[PDB]
From Swiss-Prot, chain A:
Stored InterPro entries: NADH_UbQ_OxRdtase_su1/FPO, NADH_UbQ_OxRdtase_su1_CS
Transmembrane segments: 18-38, 84-104, 124-144, 165-185, 198-218, 261-281, 288-308, 321-341, 353-373
Localization terms from the record: Cell membrane
Principal place of residence: membrane
EC number, UniProt record: 7.1.1.-
Gene Ontology CC: one annotated term: plasma membrane
Coiled coil: none
Xref: Pfam families: NADHdh
Identification of the protein by name: NADH-quinone oxidoreductase subunit H
UniProtKB/Swiss-Prot annotation, chain C:
Species in which this protein is naturally found: Mycolicibacterium smegmatis (strain ATCC 700084 / mc(2)155) (Mycobacterium smegmatis)
GO terms, molecular function: NADH:ubiquinone reductase (non-electrogenic) activity; quinone binding
Compartments (UniProt record): Cell membrane
EC number(s) per entry: 7.1.1.-
The encoding gene: nuoK
A single BP term in Gene Ontology: ATP synthesis coupled electron transport
TM regions (residue ranges): 3-23, 28-48, 59-79
Protein name: NADH-quinone oxidoreductase subunit K
Amino acid sequence: MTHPDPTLFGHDPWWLMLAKAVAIFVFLLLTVLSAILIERKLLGRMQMRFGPNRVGPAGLLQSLADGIKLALKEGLVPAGVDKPIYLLAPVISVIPAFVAFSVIPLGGAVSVFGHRTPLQLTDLPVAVLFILAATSIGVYGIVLAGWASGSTYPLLGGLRSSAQVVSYEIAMGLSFVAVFLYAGTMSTSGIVAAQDRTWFVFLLLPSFLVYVVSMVGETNRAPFDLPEAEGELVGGFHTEYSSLKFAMFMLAEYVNMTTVSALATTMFLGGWHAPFPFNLIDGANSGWWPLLWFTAKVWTFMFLYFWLRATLPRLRYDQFMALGWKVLIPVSLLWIMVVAITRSLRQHGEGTWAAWLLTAAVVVVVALIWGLATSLRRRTVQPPPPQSTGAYPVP
Amino acid sequence: ARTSTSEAVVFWVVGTVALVGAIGVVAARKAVYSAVFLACTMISLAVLYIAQDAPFLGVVQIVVYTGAVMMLFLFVLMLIGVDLTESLVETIKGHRIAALIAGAGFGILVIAGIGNVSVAGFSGLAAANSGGNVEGLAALIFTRYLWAFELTSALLITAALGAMVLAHRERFERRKTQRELAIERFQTGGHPTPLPNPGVYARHNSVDVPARLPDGSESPLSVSTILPHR
Amino acid sequence: MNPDNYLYLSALLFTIGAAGVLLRRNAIVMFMCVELMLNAANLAFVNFSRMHGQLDGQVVAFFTMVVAACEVVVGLAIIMAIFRTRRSASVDDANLLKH
Amino acid sequence: ALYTPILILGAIAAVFAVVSVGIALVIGPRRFNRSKLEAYECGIDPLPPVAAGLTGQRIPIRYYLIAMLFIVFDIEIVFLYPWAVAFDSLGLFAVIEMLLFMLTVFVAYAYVWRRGGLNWD
Amino acid sequence: TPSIEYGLLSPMLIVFGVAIAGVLIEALAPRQSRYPLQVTLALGGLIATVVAVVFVARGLSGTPGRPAVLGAVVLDAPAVFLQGTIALVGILGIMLIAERQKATVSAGEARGLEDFTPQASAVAGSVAEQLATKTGVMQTEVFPLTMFAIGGMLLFPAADDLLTMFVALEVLSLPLYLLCGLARRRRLLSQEAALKYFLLGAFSSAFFIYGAAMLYGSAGTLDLSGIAESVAAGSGNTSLALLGVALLLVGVLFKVGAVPFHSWIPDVYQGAPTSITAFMAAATKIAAFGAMLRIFYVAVPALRDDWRPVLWAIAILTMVVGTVTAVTQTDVKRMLAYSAVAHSGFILTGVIAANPAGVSSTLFYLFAYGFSTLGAFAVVGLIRNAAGDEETSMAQWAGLGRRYPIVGVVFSLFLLAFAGIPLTSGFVSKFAVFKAAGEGGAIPLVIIGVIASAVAAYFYVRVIVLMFFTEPPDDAPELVVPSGLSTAVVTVTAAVTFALGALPQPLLDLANSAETFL
């Protein structure tokens, strides 16, 4: 009822919660070590390459090889950097990334060695916003790495990280609201339980889209990989970083990818419930299979990430922020209002009045957004005048 | 009234962080350091709120003040400087000592007024948080404190109006577009087509290096206007 | 650990915040110190609300945070106008009105 | 309680990250070189130690207005979470209250937008 | 479900809805039509607010009052009195604010006589500011902001709990912080005034909230009546109650401008737009003193023996430092600022009375003094240097009355009212507060206020000397009457200051009937 379920959470023996934390840590490490190689190979395929396929069998060790190489590489500390913050920034990026994933439901209750415990490190009454807070703290690593490096390109990268926050933070916060509204809680276990009837992706599609866009932004992934923007700022904020400090920045980014995709699964795709083809199968939602389904959904989001990288340029961060404040925020806010009214009407028996509203509202939005797209702006044309430099005649 | 020794440990470490962060906010001579210290203090106070049976308040603290300190850091970079190390030297005769005395006295007096209070009855918050901390906050905010919640909208609107009136710059001061710049007697190219590059010398190729004219003099145009020669 | 300790911390934080507003010229630093005072008030509210077994003080902390955000934004607007005119964010420079 | 698992995961992460930075600084070659330690400037000599008279001391951002608006909007949007979670318990009264509040926020937003506040970045 | 007394909350709701509508007018109305609507929307709204209040006054005829929002708002006789006063003062202030430039040859007439810079975001004296002035653009956003302030100042007396008072204090302060920096001329001084007022107001509000925290800790509630029950019941922490009262008093005294906290007022009143100066010097004093009356007569009466001695000292200082510092002030605007500082202490004397006569006298004092101060600041706004800058140096005022006998006489009436000479509302006003203080056991304050008024009469009188008894200098400032709105403000204000001094029993019966809080 009142999630977190008090009969499941907060009763682990010290060793068992230690082991669950360790397992989550190792799972995130292996997930990142996978995502690296899988992303490179999938990008290769999307570009008709093979990607890494030599280092170790089938190229398995390539991510591990890169990690160990960065470990074995000289630890640079450039002069002209704020040494303390220059060394802290990777830590500030890493710690919150790992912390956020604590309240992610990787499964339902299971009886490990007699102890009935969740396949989830823990859960909080405000878990979703706790993840949001951890991710927000994580951006300080990016910004302070940019600033403390004392070089123009890292400085610009860090400023782009600040702008990135200004773009995605409010959109993400608003996107959470509709899920809270249909769930009646902020715990992730409660949000998954509330999705037994149906996944909120079908119900809260606008919220899902806004959250996913703000997500791709939050992790600094293409087409919003602006803080790095190798094509503009060379290496962005992680210029001036080498070896395990750069490796920590990138591991933090990939763990943020994993955390936000796991949240997306948790609060829009039934969390760990088996998809439809296995929904009818006995015990598909029990034992360890929920872990498989959760990882499958998370990795579909990972695929979406890689696919975005392989098929889109990167916006200018001003364009992205204009997206966030002119499309994402208005759409999320109006969706929150529409969904609230819809639920109030359904609870008041109005019935059709809600359906007429809901369908109409999006229909209106889909128009006015196109208005800001083609039908009213961003699709105009002009001319110009010549100067005194004896210009030719344009046919 | 003594809360669990775990809460004691949490308070001690986190409040140490918070107090040091406030002290650094006041004392750090680089404004960015002061911003980071403020972020630390806000994070610590959020942790304390969580520890005091106030989860939602602490989490919102972390979120909103992450945002706020990010913006304050941006404004430090804009208006103060990127790594400017302020003097913090008393400019008002004896003001520093007077401020230290007044602050210390006010702190001592406030501590004296607070004195021992918890010994007079400390009703735990369990009866309140039961049913949902956020649920209780919603009950209060939209039932008893509905009027204040409504007036927060007035606060928001006034902030927006102030920002627009004092910060937003209308057409008159709008910067010219690249499109606009290329035009007007072919600006930026008719004129020194692309201004001459800074000179390249053995042992010196930085942007601050002025280029050499045929007679051997240094071309003023090669080095940007803002640089202090070389 | 006596819960009253929190209040002392709050009292300290507010005090430091106060001292900051008196000691630091940079308007942004003054704003952060004001934020410190407001957050100390929030801490006092949270502790007292815990003491009285009600969420009232926790609610009040929200409104204090809202007021802090609006105050900071207004101060930023005023400082932006002043900085445009003067290119300096020091409070001591705004000394024309006196005596 | 109920948070000590989060603390264990945070401790694991912090030990991992601090030891990671320590390994970065400790493992692998280390050789002092003034050129290596100088700022990266795409291969060009970085400016004199006194970067310049004035110079990059202060970085204008073209979205100061949106940053200011972000402060207030981000804080003001947190009222929705308790309202969202308490929905179906507060009743139509709270629905109307938040609809009015969100209309006030919308008026603020529309004033900012239609008056070009969101345009300069 | 909650029950909302819409009929009760009607005035504040009307003002805040009007402010929101004005922001809408800014958002989606074309430039040329913005000002005509705003001044239409604002004034009417306030007039409507005034109307609402009187009906609410009829509503409270039988019962003493009522809470509205489950506490947090109580419309009682003092609350409706203060809200009506603030509504009238807001109408006058917006008539001052809406005054446009005196169209001379060009159509660039744009809300400049209101003294508002065409584009406050521009560097003062920049080509952009000059071009905006030539094009006659005005930042009409002023009208909503002002309205918001009034809204807050309407609530701040009527707030029935600490949270609502704090929110209202911020809601009224932030608009004034912004407005103080929009002056059309001496833009450097206006911007400095805005910065000072923001910094010190944020400081005071931090103290206010921390004191609210202490009061809540002592009482276990933040509804004022609950705090009174706790402190009277002796159940709460007495030390925390006292510390919270003191810290809250710090903020409210800043708002009214007591000497320990008055330092902002001289600079802010000098540098702020003259229209906004006139508006604030009345409205903010009224709202702050209303809230302080509520706190000291509802929230914490039982601790009188504990907080009486403090206010005493403050009042003493307020009357002395406020008046003595004005004796040798040489700028008219700054002199009126110190006059307001002194009259804050005069009000505080009748607050110290802690008796119903105290409340009645305080309400009358606020009404009459707010009107008089608004009129005096409007007049000070009418006087112009040859360059257009509001001539405020007293020397340039020599022979001003002789050149302009009507305005000279009106301003002399306002000065005499501030001094409290009989036949002016200022006398009746100071007499009422002093009578309450003496009847309340604070006769020594009456004596000190007598002495302070004797000292202040000097600087009130030197200005009349300059106007009438001196021949105008070679470069005497001219009187610009920008629009009939300012004339109406001056006439209504002076007529009030005079009638309410000769035959004050009207509105004094209403002050008496407003002697009790809910």
